[PDB]
């Protein structure tokens, strides 16, 4: 039922910025919190932030804090309003920021437990 | 040897249950009129010998509060008046920084082929541009229900009474965190006075921890797990609009009235809050005292604001006199902790398009209110969130950390009497 | 002693059944939202009780607190003593260990009460 | 149905005092008295005397009363019906008349004619 | 930290298969097995240690507490190789890639 | 055998009185459109399950499912044999043959109680 | 067939200025008129 659909693949020069945009559907997605991992070429994935889609809260890992910004955009339809779709804005893009970037969803309805059950597809962002 | 089963009917046992919960209330939209009248004598019974095990995180008196809150607002904005004829574009001017607007605009009278253009005053967080045209701030996604200016936004002690063959088990253990085994139990059929306070960072009005400070989450190295500490002593908060507005009736139809905001008289001011720096030093280092037993006797605790979100969390959200207020807390959470008069001023803002909730598709419009209003409370808890060199930030917006703060002391159980055991015991022929 | 509304509960399973009266009172009674919320309390109130007191009326413990019956104890539902189960386990940990052959006993309770009438409606046809 | 695990072996000289622990699991510690019994050279086995962890109460022999610490901390609860205790023995004017072991003894019932009776035993702890 | 033996592991199709994970202090029980092939996404396996996801072939298993924790594949087949992660909240583990 | 509810249906009077405690489980619990609906049904049930145990309790049969009365049973209201009613009709055939006659018998097993125990109030009384 | 059972020797204290059947007749009413005018059509377009 969960489908998160991410954006596509950015090109970008260093200290540039990127915006990622992650289309969300078939869930309730105000009670379902919204993680980003990264993954480097040949390192693991790593943990960049997450947002809590009812109000917006957010938390990030080391050092995101200071470049990194997510923010949503919940629907407003009185009849469709599962959906959403998150933002990821990293500004100072370095060129060790070139990574694949997933969308994650948490399964637990509410609460969280970090069992990630829906993924996006995943965008390849290059800093060069 | 000779051995026969006897049964015994009202023997002390019972089984984790969860049923539906009754109010009760002593002598406003939480409507404890309707609730059945609070005993004055609320019978408390120890329960010797008992150990039992809770779970504040998955109690289920949180989630029927938190829906029997939410089931209160709907019900108390139905018999209220409609401000759909209000989605009109508005004229608005700044007042003689720019915060607050004054617009004009064609508006129904109570003849159907009549207009009229009577103004009024808006904050600037209710009103979008498109004299500067403007227009309310939920006319292009719902519609927006006037709240009843007879019902009050003030917290009543509500007592919430499990049916008869159910009953509640209260914790007596003054230092018992979430979850575990409780040592001293004893049984209740109705809770205490719980104050229904919509919140926000700061918990206002709860009630107090014995002894010393305590601090609680599922899994406080889960740092999505918003931290809820509860103080010892209250720190004292000032809030007040110091603005002494006016409330205007305007007449939009046969029977409906528009509340409007007529004009300021006197001086315009800035709407905050005040708590004593000192009393707020010393709370923040028995908490962070506390946070010491769990993060690391040495590593540093820092304390910093709201890093996103909606006003509803980034600043502290509650309601004072009635008016919903948003305050700025940055210089509360603004102090980083080694291993080893006074007044803080909060800049709050001022809303009256409100949704209550997350509510997709309904929205209020709460009516001025004539006066200056001031408001004294105690913030007695607090929500915090670590970051993951351990930082912690405010915030909050999940309704039920609110109830979960006054509902951890409390359980759910339902009574099963028949027991089966055997005695050397044998009917007749 | 009056120790109160489920006092005993940590006490010995003898020690409890002398207070059954205690729990048996506030078991009725008590020791628009919530118009429909209460009136669906004040309805379940009722119905868990007449099961309890279904349960009594078919094994002849109608009216009885504490009521012997014909169904010997099988050794198999628990293999312990009795001065080890009154005077030392307590009502809820009984509850635990008997969990899983509850249901057996409530039927051998039944129709060792509808034999036992119909071996009285014999005794009467003389 | 439980452990009750006591100290080592603390071997000292006549006049001095010795302390001997017992650590209970697996029962409701302050649901059971715990009787001290010893087994020394010399005689047979000699009871001592046994306190009750829940009413706080000590009962000992006249051959032990103006001898004997006995004192308990207080259960730190585990589950409903499980906890783990603690059970403190000392005794004042040793000699090498009290060298033996020593054991702690849970008491058997919580009602009855046998409340108190050492049921479930420790391990042992060989004095001077 | 996440720590999964072995690193690399020589597989055969039909075999009893399985990967340690490691951790640094004490988790509980709320140990997550992914699978994560290359150009594709995560796929979440089992989920609160040994919870296993609706529709995963009922081959999969997982064990563990405390400090350790297992991913067991009995009749190992050819849609089975791929990297596992073990994840502890936001913590993924390198992986172990099957061939 | 073990026949289910109203298994014994078409059985004789004989064999069906011997599987009462079948459908005396069933008459309790079971073998916002329909919410009010529901609870109306809930409301309903206990009151003609309390009504069957009023009668029972101002006959002297509280706790019985078969009980022994006072009246002896006039020829008018049946006049068969003993041999030809429980060894041949249905208790659904017997509710028909007396079913005029059902109100009369109510009303005599009444003051056959309330004399009995006032009979037994005096039997005491000394 | 309304049953009307006569007590003999009864003698009872009435008050018809205390009686609450009639404060709960009057709010009875007043609740029928209400509830018989939910679904009939407003005239408020009138009002011109
Ligand atoms: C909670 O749980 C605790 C622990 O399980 C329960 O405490 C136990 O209770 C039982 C029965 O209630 C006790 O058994 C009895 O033991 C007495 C021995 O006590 C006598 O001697 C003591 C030492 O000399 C002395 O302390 C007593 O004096 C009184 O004063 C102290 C002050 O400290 C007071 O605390 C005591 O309570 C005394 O009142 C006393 O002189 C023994 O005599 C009893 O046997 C008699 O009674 C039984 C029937 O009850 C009968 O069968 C016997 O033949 C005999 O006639 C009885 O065995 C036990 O010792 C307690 N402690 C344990 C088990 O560690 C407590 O009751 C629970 N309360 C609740 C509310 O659930
Ligand atoms: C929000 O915005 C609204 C506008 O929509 C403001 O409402 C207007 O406020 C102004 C003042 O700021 C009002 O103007 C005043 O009108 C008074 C009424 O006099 C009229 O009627 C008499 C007949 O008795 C006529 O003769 C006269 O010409 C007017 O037509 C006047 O008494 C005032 O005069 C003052 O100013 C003049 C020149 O400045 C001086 O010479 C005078 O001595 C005197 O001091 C003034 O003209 C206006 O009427 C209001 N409009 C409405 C529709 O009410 C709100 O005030 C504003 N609120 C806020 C908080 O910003
Ligand atoms: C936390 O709890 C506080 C107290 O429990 C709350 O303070 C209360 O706030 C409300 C509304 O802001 C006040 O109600 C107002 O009362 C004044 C008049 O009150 C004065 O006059 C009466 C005479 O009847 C007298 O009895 C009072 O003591 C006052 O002297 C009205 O003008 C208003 O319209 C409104 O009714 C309460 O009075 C006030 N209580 C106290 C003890 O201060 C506080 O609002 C709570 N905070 C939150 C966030 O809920
Ligand atoms: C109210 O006052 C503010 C403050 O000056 C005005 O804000 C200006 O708006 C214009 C757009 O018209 C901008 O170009 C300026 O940069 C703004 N200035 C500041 C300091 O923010 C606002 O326009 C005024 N509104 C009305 C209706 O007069
Ligand atoms: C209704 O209008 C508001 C105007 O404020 C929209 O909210 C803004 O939308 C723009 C672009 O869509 C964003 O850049 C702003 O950040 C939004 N502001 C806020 C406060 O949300 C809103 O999206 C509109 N809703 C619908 C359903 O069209
Ligand atoms: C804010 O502060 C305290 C609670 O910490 C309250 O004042 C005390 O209230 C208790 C019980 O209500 C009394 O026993 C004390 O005597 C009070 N102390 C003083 C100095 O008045 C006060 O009511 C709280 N306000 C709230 C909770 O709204
Ligand atoms: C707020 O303003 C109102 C007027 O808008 C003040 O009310 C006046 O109070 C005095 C008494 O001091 C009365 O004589 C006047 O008739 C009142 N005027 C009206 C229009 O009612 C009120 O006192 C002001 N309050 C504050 C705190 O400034
Ligand atoms: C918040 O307001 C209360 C009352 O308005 C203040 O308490 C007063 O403090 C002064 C100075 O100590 C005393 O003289 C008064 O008697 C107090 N009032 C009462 C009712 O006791 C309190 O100091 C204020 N706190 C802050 C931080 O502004
Ligand atoms: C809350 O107050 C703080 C200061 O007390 C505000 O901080 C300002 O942040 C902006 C960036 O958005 C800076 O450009 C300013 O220099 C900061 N001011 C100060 C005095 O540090 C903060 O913006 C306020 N919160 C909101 C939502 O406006
Ligand atoms: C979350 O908290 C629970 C409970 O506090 C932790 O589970 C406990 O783990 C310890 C360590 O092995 C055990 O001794 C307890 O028996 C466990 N209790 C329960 C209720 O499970 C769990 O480890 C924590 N998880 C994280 C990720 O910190
Ligand atoms: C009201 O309508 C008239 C009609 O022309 C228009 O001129 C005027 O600007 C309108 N006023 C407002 C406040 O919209
Ligand atoms: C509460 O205390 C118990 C035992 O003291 C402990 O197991 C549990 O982890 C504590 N709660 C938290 C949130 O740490
Ligand atoms: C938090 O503080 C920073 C710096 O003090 C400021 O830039 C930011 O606007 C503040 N945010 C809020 C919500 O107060
Ligand atoms: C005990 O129960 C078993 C089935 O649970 C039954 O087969 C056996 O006959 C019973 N024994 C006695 C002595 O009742
Ligand atoms: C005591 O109980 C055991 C069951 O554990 C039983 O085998 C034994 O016969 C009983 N003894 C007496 C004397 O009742
Ligand atoms: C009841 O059945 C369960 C089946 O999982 C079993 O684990 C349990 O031990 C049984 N109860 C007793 C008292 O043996
Ligand atoms: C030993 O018993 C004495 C009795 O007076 C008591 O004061 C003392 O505290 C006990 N020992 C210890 C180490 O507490
Ligand atoms: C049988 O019933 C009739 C009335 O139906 C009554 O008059 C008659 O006395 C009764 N006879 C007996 C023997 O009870
Ligand atoms: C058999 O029943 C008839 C009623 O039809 C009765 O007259 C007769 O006395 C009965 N005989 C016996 C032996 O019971
Ligand atoms: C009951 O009364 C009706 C009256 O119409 C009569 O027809 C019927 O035969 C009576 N029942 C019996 C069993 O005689």
């Known amino acids: 039922r969960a489908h998160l659909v991410q954006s596509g693949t950015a090109m970008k020069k260093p200290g540039a910025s990127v915006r990622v945009s992650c289309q969300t559907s078939g869930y309730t997605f105000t009670a379902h919190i919204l993680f980003w991992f990264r993954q480097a070429p040949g390192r693991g994935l790593e943990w960049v932030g997450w947002i809590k889609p009812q109000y917006g809260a957010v938390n990030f890992g080391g050092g995101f804090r200071d470049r990194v910004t997510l923010t949503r955009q919940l629907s407003q339809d009185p009849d469709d309003p599962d959906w959403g779709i998150a933002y990821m804005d990293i500004r100072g893009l370095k060129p060790d920021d070139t990574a694949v970037y997933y969308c994650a969803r948490d399964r637990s309805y509410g609460d969280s437990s970090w069992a990630l059950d829906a993924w996006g597809q995943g965008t390849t962002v290059v800093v060069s | 040897e000779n051995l026969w089963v006897t049964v015994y009917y009202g023997v002390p046992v019972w089984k984790d249950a969860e049923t539906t919960l009754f109010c009760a209330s002593d002598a406003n939209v939480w409507a404890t009129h309707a609730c059945v009248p609070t005993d004055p004598n609320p019978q408390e019974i120890h329960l010797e010998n008992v150990t039992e095990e809770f779970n504040m995180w998955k109690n289920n008196m949180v989630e029927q509060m938190h829906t029997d809150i939410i089931s209160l607002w709907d019900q108390s904005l139905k018999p209220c008046v409609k401000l759909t004829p209000l989605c009109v574009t508005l004229q608005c001017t700044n007042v003689t920084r720019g915060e607050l607007k004054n617009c004009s605009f064609n508006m129904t009278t109570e003849l159907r082929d009549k207009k009229q253009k009577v103004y009024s005053l808006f904050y600037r967080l209710d009103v979008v541009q498109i004299n500067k045209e403007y227009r309310l701030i939920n006319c292009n996604t719902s519609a927006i229900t006037q709240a009843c200016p007879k019902v009050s936004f003030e917290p009543i002690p509500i007592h919430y009474c499990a049916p008869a063959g159910f009953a509640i088990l209260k914790c007596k253990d003054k230092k018992f965190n979430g979850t575990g085994p409780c040592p001293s139990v004893s049984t209740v059929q109705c809770t205490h006075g719980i104050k229904p306070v919509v919140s926000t960072q700061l918990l206002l009005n709860g009630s107090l921890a014995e002894e010393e400070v305590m601090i609680r989450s599922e899994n406080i190295t889960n740092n999505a797990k918003n931290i809820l500490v509860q103080f010892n002593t209250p720190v004292q908060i000032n809030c007040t609009r110091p603005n002494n507005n006016t409330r205007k009736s305007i007449r939009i139809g046969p029977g409906q009235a528009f509340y409007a905001t007529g004009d300021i008289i006197g001086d315009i001011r800035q709407a905050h809050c005040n708590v004593s720096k000192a009393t707020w030093n010393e709370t923040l280092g028995k908490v962070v005292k506390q946070l010491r037993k769990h993060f690391g006797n040495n590593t540093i605790i820092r304390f910093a604001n709201s890093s996103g979100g909606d006003l509803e969390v980034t600043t502290h959200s509650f309601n004072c006199g009635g008016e919903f207020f948003y305050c700025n807390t940055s210089g509360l959470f603004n102090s980083t902790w080694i291993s080893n008069n006074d007044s803080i001023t909060l800049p709050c803002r001022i809303k009256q398009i409100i949704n209550m909730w997350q509510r997709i598709g309904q929205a209020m419009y709460a009516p001025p209110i004539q006066g200056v209003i001031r408001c004294v409370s105690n913030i007695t808890g607090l929500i915090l969130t670590r970051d993951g060199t351990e930082t912690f930030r405010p915030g909050g917006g999940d309704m039920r950390d609110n109830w979960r703060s006054e509902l951890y002391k409390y359980k759910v159980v339902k009574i099963e009497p028949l027991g089966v055991a055997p005695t050397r015991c044998k009917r007749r022929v | 002693v009056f120790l109160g509304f489920l006092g005993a509960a940590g006490s010995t399973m003898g020690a409890a059944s002398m207070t059954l009266t205690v729990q048996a009172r506030n078991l009725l009674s008590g020791i628009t939202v919530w118009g429909i919320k209460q009136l669906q309390a004040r309805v379940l109130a009722v119905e868990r009780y007449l099961r309890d007191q279904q349960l009594l009326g078919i094994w002849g413990c109608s009216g009885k607190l504490i009521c012997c019956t014909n169904v010997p104890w099988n050794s198999s539902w628990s293999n312990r003593n009795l001065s080890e189960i009154w005077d030392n386990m307590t009502w809820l940990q009984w509850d635990k260990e008997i969990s899983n052959y509850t249901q057996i006993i409530y039927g051998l309770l039944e129709e060792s009460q509808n034999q036992q009438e119909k071996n009285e409606q014999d005794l009467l046809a003389l | ?128 | ?99």
């Open chain 5, 1 to 99: 930290h996440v720590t999964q033996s072995p690193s690399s592991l020589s597989v055969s199709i039909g075999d009893r298969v399985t990967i340690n994970c490691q951790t640094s202090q004490g988790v509980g029980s709320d140990l997550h097995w992914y699978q994560h092939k290359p150009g594709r996404a995560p796929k979440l396996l089992i989920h609160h240690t040994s919870s296993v996801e609706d529709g995963v072939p009922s081959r999969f298993s997982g064990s563990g507490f405390h400090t350790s924790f297992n991913l067991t594949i009995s009749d190992l087949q050819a849609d089975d190789i791929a990297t596992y992660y073990c994840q502890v909240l936001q913590f993924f583990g390198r992986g172990s890639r099957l061939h």
């Open chain 4, 1 to 128: 149905q439980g452990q009750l695990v006591q100290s080592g072996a603390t071997t000292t000289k006549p006049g001095s005092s010795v302390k001997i622990s017992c650590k209970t699991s697996g029962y409701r510690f302050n649901f059971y008295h715990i009787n001290w019994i010893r087994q020394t050279a010399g005689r047979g086995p000699e009871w001592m005397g046994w306190i009750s962890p829940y009413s706080g109460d000590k009962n000992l022999a006249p051959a032990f009363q103006d001898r004997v610490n006995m004192t308990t901390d207080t259960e730190v609860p585990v589950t409903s019906f499980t906890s783990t205790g603690a059970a403190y023995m000392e005794i004042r004017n040793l000699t090498s008349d009290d060298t033996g072991t020593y054991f702690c003894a849970k008491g058997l019932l919580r009602d009855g004619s046998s409340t108190w009776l050492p049921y479930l035993w420790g391990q042992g702890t060989l004095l001077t």
